[PDB]
Structures are given as C-alpha cells and as structure tokens.
Amino acid sequence: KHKILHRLLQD
Amino acid sequence: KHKILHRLLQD
Amino acid sequence: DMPVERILEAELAVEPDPVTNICQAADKQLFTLVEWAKRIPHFSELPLDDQVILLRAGWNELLIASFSHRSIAVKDGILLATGLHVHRNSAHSAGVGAIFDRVLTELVSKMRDMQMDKTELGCLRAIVLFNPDSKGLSNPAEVEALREKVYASLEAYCKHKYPEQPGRFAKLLLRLPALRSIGLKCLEHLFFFKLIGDTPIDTFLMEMLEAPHQ
Amino acid sequence: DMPVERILEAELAVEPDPVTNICQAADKQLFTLVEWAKRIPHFSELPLDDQVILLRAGWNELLIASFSHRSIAVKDGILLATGLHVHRNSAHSAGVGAIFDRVLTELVSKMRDMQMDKTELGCLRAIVLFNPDSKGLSNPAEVEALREKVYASLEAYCKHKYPEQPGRFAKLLLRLPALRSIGLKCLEHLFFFKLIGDTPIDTFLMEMLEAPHQ
C-alpha cells in the first residue's frame, strides 16, 4: 500500500 | 456587476 | 447586540435527474437566502458592496447548512426546499454519490446525533455569513467584530440551554471545516454541470458562478 | 489523559524556483510529521491502518499550520523548515501569489495578531490529526473521543493562560475552516505541478499524492 508511511509508523 | 443580488439587497 | 432570539427568528421566517432538481431548488433558495441575511442583526447596515461580497462568498455553505439541518429526520437522504426528498440511491445513480454521502455522514448525521437546534443552526450560519476572510471587504474588522458577537452569543446560549454538555459549543464550531470542504466540492460539481451544458442552471445560481470584478 | 504539556513537548521536539524549494521542504517535513504524530498522546495506540489514514488525510493542513506559525515574525513571507525565507514577491513571480497571500492573510497574520502560542498551535494540529471524518477509519468514535479530549484540554489551557480573553478558544478553532480551504488549494497546486512534469517531487511527497486503495 503506502510503503514509506507504513515503514515509518511501524518503526 | 452582480445584477440580481444587488437589486435584491437594495430593495 | 447580537441576540440569538433575532437569529432564531431569521431562521423561522425563512422556513418553507436529481441534480436538475437540486440546482432548481438552489436557485430558489438563493432568493430566500437574501431575505434571511437581511434579518440577521447588522448585516443590512454594512455597505452594499460588502453585503454582496459576504453573500457571494458564503451562499453555498449557507445553503448546505440549511438543507442538511432540514434533513435531520430523513433516513439516508435529504429534503429539498421544494418538498422533494432525495435519497442516497438516487444521488448515487446520478453520479454524485460520493459528495452526497459526505453531506449525510459529515453534516446530516452529526447534526442529528447531537440534536443541533434551530438557534444553533442560525448562529452557525451567521458565523459563516460574517466571514472576515472574504476578499474585497471594505472593512474586514467590522465583519470580524460581528462574527465574534455571534459566537459569544452562541456559546452563552449553549451553556444555558445545555449545561450538561460542556463541549457542545466547540462541537458545533468543529463542523465548520467539514462544511467549508463540502461547500468547495459542491461548487466544483456545479461548475462542471455548467461546463457540460446539460442540467439547466437558472439565473441566480448562474450569477453566483460569474467571475467577480477583480 | 490529553495533557497540553505533552502536546507542547511534541511541538518542541520536532522544531528544526520557490515552488521547488517548498516541495523539497514539504517532503523533508513529512518524515518529521510522523515523528510528531507519534509523540501525540494515544496516536500510536490506534491501529496502524488508522494512523496511516489520519496522516494521509491531514498532512497538508498539518504542515501548513506548522510553517505558518513558524513565520509569525516574518514580514510578508514564510520561513521554510530548511531555513530559507520565501517572500511574497518571490511567490508572486512564480505564479502562486494568490494562494501564498491567503496563507499570509488568513493564517500567518492572524496567528501573529493574536500571538497564538506553541501549545495552542500544538492542540490545533492535534485536533486536525484526530479527524473523525477521515474515510476508512476502523473506529471513528475513538478518534472523535481523542479530538474531544484535545479541545477540552485546549479550552482549559486558554481560560487559564489568557483569562482576560474569553473568546480566544473560539478564535483558535475558527481558523480551522480557513486551514481546510487553503490545504485543499495547496493540494490542487501540488497535483498540477506533478501533472506538468516540471518541479521535482520527492518520494514521500509523491506517495502522499498516490491514490488510496478504495
């Protein structure tokens, strides 16, 4: 989906 | 200008 | 100075293809909008050019607030000033389902859930009318002053009529961003209907789509 | 539950062709926006999908509120997070003068005139973040609950810090409709820059312009 945002929120 | 509106507000 | 009683009176005095019927009703309500504005304290005292600016700047939001509140007891639909009920399915079948749903979800349902009353509706509309950000205003400070008087009276009213709901005043004001967004989107749709050529657009509604004079 | 002190801390922790520089700075600030949101009470507790929805729905308004407040002491211009000052003349010479002027007139100048503080800015941004109208939300009631807690804390703060200004709370909330309108207009501009092809748009900013997933 929205790759960058997900990765940043996950961290 | 804005004919209708002016006429209605004037009255 | 800005009695909610007067604002309520203004609301009460004005009380009465899906797209074609909606546009038809919008043109009709614009005439009524002018009469309503005149009944709002101090509006008619502002210079004629400013009265024009305020109405041209807020008519769509003003009309949307009105039909939304009128539609509170309507299920999955809206009630037009002409007496015609327009259901969600009809709007969807006409290609304007998305914006129709925003109206129902962000405005109608919220007004219904909190039981917004006619006095509150009136005050919210008066706040919208007295928009100090409207470009060209000869004296924006005066309009801003009027807006401040309206919300001061509104908060006083809320605290008095609904003491058990301390966040009601803020709740009412927080529906304004949604109203602004929905108003802009409805305007985009109107311009497109005009552009296409289909869908009759009466003279007053058409005049609102005219460009200003820089 | 929703302490303004935490919100203030979030603001402080995040503290740092004209169009190309603005877009460049926007991409940069999006990363910072995520860090800011995480520091806002209870945001990180919401499900991951809702966190995504809220940020995708409010990023532009959130970033506009930030640079506008950062620009309070700037005359006829705005201060980008990169340290670059962009003056009105420059924006006008780039063809985006109208929207730039709205920012200065409806946001920057208003914030300056009332001396909006960082706590108030923080609360306003938190209210924008916790937008219960954002489509797709798994539990809109929860987000709405958080929003209510933010404005309850904000009003308490205003009444305490500025007892001599009874209309300050309402004044702060009434800048949200302008913020919504300006945010939509800035987004339209961004989409056009993307459409034209000129103006480099970095990956994060570009991802925000991606379509959702219905």
Ligand SMILES: CC/C=C/C/C=C\C/C=C/C/C=C/C/C=C\C/C=C\CCC(=O)O
């Ligand atoms: C109801 C709006 C959403 C549906 C899409 C079609 C309509 C677009 C028309 C745009 C004009 C702006 C809207 C503001 C007010 C007029 C339309 C609503 C009803 C007319 C007034 C009434 O019956 O009370």
Ligand SMILES: CC/C=C/C/C=C\C/C=C/C/C=C/C/C=C\C/C=C\CCC(=O)O
């Ligand atoms: C400043 C907006 C008006 C000028 C016209 C050009 C810009 C249009 C860009 C649209 C993107 C949406 C705007 C929201 C935030 C980003 C732009 C502002 C500055 C970047 C962040 C910063 O420096 O704090």
